[PDB]
Curated annotation (Swiss-Prot):
Mainly expressed in spermatogonia. Localized on the principle piece in the sperm (at protein level). Expression significantly decreased in the testis of elderly men. Catalyzes one of the two ATP producing reactions in the glycolytic pathway via the reversible conversion of 1,3-diphosphoglycerate to 3-phosphoglycerate. Both L- and D- forms of purine and pyrimidine nucleotides can be used as substrates, but the activity is much lower on pyrimidines. In addition to its role as a glycolytic enzyme, it seems that PGK1 acts as a polymerase alpha cofactor protein (primer recognition protein). The modification N6-malonyllysine is found at K130. ATP binds at A212, K217, G236, G310, E341, D372, T373. CDD domains: Phosphoglycerate_kinase (cd00318). It comes from Homo sapiens (Human). AMP binds at A212, K213, K217, G236, G310, E341. ADP binds at G211, G235, F340. It comes from the Eukaryota. This is Phosphoglycerate kinase 1. CDP binds at G211, D216, G235, G335, V337, F340.
Amino acid sequence: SLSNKLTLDKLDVKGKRVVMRVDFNVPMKNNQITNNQRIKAAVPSIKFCLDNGAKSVVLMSHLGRPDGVPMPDKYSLEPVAVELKSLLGKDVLFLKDCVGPEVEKACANPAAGSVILLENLRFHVEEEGKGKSGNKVKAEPAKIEAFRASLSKLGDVYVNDAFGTAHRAHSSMVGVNLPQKAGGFLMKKELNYFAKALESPERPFLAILGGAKVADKIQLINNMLDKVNEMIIGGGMAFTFLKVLNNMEIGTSLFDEEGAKIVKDLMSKAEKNGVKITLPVDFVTADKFDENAKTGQATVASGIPAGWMGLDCGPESSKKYAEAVTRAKQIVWNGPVGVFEWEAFARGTKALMDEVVKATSRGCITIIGGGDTATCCAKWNTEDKVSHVSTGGGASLELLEGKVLPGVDALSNI
């Protein structure tokens, strides 16, 4: 189902006004652009619209956590419009707002081929439906409707290329009421790879799940147990498993008291569905949860001593993970297996990444989830050595958990 939605390439844009939700949430300081990866990513869609004779391309986006209070001093899209101007090679009109009669007059009938960028959408509480020196404060249904009609007035067709926000029922996500709502090329990529993963995956299908807590991932694991042939359970999660399944001593490591109660239920579902579960067997320990702490080594047989904590897996665990990855024809990896921000505890994640790169090289379908694992793909420069790297963490997680995305659902079928 995720595949049969309308995309930009199947849309007719010649002579129409295109209003397009992009992902320009580039988090950098001094109002100078240090990493414009997302801007470069959103370029092919704008260029398609321009090179197919569109009258205008209007771009709405967000940046920061302002919670619906105008913060133009600190979180303004202005420098982006400069960056974009270079990457497009074309003038881009920056407007000081994204709604109202002035913006509506600006976008009513612009010159042929104009590119316009609106001010941050999250200056308004009506985008997210709730916000905040004003503390937490809400929105008003009539005002949300007015905001949505104002965005709807800005173009003849709508394009959504903001996958990372597609799990939020926000006004820019579901409140543009135009006859055709298409998905941009980033959207098309995401929906293709994840519909293949969730609907008809190559087999054997492997899921690699890491994280710090078991309780928030239950449904994830649960849904992943209806899909896959193998599961690797790594990261801080695993100790909660090992303390419960094998009575392992874990030292000062993360323990999920709630998730400890459902560990055996998940193993029971895995046994009922015939899923092979791979947990770590050795560990790199630390004296404290710090970057420059003393290190050590432990095994499931030895246990972790008191006062120390496990922050990464060891070489034998890497061998077992590589066994699992070697058997796989499709892989989905969400969440690293160690504290990769700190070089002393990034060895397991790096080794698993190398194994996934080789698997890709010999024909595996390797999808990397948003969040920290995409950050790993960027930190070791391997985005071009895997099949797919998702652009959104929460959205991809909610797709994996089996949920329907409000922004995706709001696209036109056929």
